Structure formats: structure tokens, C-alpha cells
Design a protein around this ligand. Structure first.
Ligand SMILES: [Cl-]
Ligand SMILES: [Cl-]
Lengths: 180, 180
């Protein structure tokens, strides 16, 4: 069963488009907003991917991209995630996971990255009727194959920056909203 | 060693207030939403305490009451738990653990319960970080010196209801969010 039911769908009931721009909206009980950036510690600019604490904000427009020449994004297929309008200090728009003092965290980079470093995300369906909710998987470089066994979660820090990090116990759930 | 945090702490890091309203929510977002009622079996009304399946819902406002003439709830203290807005058919807002073929379950009652029947709950703190997480125990005691080890957990029934029951499966690990 291939199924059209396998492609990602946005909050409006429309197929998620490769290269399209979307807002990533946490689907959990804690109030807040979409995903955006923030400057933490060292960083000379916002290189830390975080969930907005503001509730009226849908966060930053984000591109969901598959290198392959497909119009729609199938679940379980690898994708790169990035900001369509990243901080002037970021080399590229793409998110990447780097081990931080607090553990594997989602950040932007000041140096261009190879394909293998950005194609590390995958959306996993959470069963709901009428709506489409997903969990976000992270898949390190298991050499040549792929290996999605870790999820992305939120780790509130000292200042209250809701940082996106790799979590083994508490994954985020998200809905995708087409950024017009 | 002491340090106030030997009084129950809410989600916002502030001490829990006796007789105040709170939302009992899962530390793990994917587990669902807040606590509410459901009509199960031959119940003529919502007398079964359950966790909401909607991850985004905070559920029912719940009052945490200590039987003492105090303002803040001391850890290790017995508390009564009740819905501030209970179903009309309910004699009182207070939860009680009633035995049943499936085992002991958390229910509301159409008849008034004696203090000894509602003063049976205790919150047990599981460590980690700054956000306080607590397991929930059912304790039927009096004059000893032993750690109560009967926890309340989730058991999903044939119809999907996520019933709160005394069990070792799906132990509840809650955060207490102050309502308003
Ligand atoms: Cl959050
Ligand atoms: Cl839980």
C-alpha cells in the first residue's frame, strides 16, 4: 500500500508541498507559538531553534525540502528543514543537530553544510480524526543507510528559551500551517 | 536537608495553594490532555475520572485540598482531589477510589462520601530539572513509618476512555498547572 494517505497534509487539508513554506505549530497542552530563532549564550546572533513563547505568533516561515524531484512530501521520507528568512549570520537556512553542552540541539550554522548534514528529519504521523498531527524524527548519519530513532523535543533553559533538542522521552507533536 | 520545595510546586514554579484550582497534565505531551469525566458502563452520568485524549486540552479545573488549616500543601501530605465544576448528578466534587472487577478505579459518587474516603491521595515527586513532576498515589493508612507504594495510572477501556485506576501501568506523572 503506497497510498495518497501517506503524504503530509497541512492544517487546511492540503498536501504539504516540497519546497513550500510552512509554520510549524506545536500541538501540545502548553501555550506558546510556532518555531523561530533565538540567540543563546555564545552565539553572536540567533542560531538556536526554539518554540516561540508568544501565543499570537506562528513563528518563522519554514521550508520543508526533499532533494528528490517530487511535488509532495511522503511520510517517512527524509527532509531538510530551514528558515526562508534566516538571521544574516547564518550561512544557510538549514537546521542541523549539533551536540551542545546541554545535549544534541537544533541549530543554524555559520558555515555551509553538506547534504548529509541537513537531510536528517522525518515526520511521523500521530493518529487523529479530521486533523493531521506529526512527531518530528531526527536521524544522525548512520553511515550510508538512514536511522530515525530519536525525536525532537523542547528543553526550557535558564532564561526560559524553549529550545528544540533531541529527546528520547518527550517528543513534540506538530501541525503544519501553510505560510501564505 | 530541607528547602521549601517540600511543599507541592506548580508548573510555573509557584507553591500549590490549598483549595486552589489546577489542571493535572502529563509531563509527556503525547500522553494527552488534562483530567475530566466520562460516562462508562451503566453509569447514568459522567462518574468515571479519565484523561482527555486531546493533547491540547487542559481538561477540568481541579481543586487540591489539604485537610489542614494551611495555605500551601506540604509534600507527603494526604489530599482530596475534586472537580471545581462536577456533573450535576455528583453528590460532591471529590474523587474516591472504588473497587471494581477490573480493579480499584477513580470515580465520582452520587452520594456524599466520608472524609476517610476522599482524603486518600498523595503526590510523590519524581526529580529532574526545574519543572516539578509528581506521581499520584492511593494510600489507605494511619499510624506508620513506611513509603506508600500504590500509584494511579491509566487503563484504556474498550471504548478508548483513558480511565485513571490504581495500577502500575502507564503511571501518572503530572505537572500541576494553576488555573483561573
Ligand atoms: Cl513550550
Ligand atoms: Cl502521565
Amino acid at each position: 500500500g503506497s497510498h495518497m494517505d501517506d503524504d503530509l497534509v497541512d492544517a487546511e487539508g492540503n498536501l504539504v508541498e516540497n519546497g513550500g513554506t510552512y509554520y510549524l505549530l506545536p500541538h501540545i497542552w502548553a501555550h506558546g507559538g510556532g518555531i523561530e530563532t533565538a540567540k543563546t549564550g555564545n552565539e553572536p546572533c540567533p542560531l538556536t531553534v526554539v518554540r516561540s513563547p508568544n501565543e499570537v505568533s506562528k513563528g518563522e516561515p519554514i521550508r520543508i525540502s526533499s532533494p528528490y524531484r517530487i511535488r509532495f512530501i511522503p511520510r517517512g521520507s527524509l527532509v531538510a528543514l530551514g528558515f526562508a528568512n534566516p538571521p544574516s549570520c547564518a550561512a544557510s537556512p538549514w537546521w542541523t543537530v549539533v551536540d551542545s553542552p546541554q545535549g544534541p540541539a537544533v541549530k543554524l550554522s555559520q558555515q555551509k553544510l553538506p547534504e548529509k548534514d541537513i537531510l536528517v528529519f522525518k515526520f511521523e504521523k500521530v493518529s487523529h480524526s479530521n486533523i493531521h498531527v506529526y512527531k518530528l524524527l531526527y536521524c544522525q548519519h548512520d553511515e550510508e543507510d538512514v536511522k530515525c530513532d530519536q525525536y525532537i523535543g523542547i528543553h526550557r533553559d535558564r532564561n526560559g528559551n524553549r529550545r528544540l533538542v533531541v529527546t528520547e522521552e518527550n517528543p513534540l507533536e506538530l501541525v503544519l500551517l501553510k505560510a501564505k
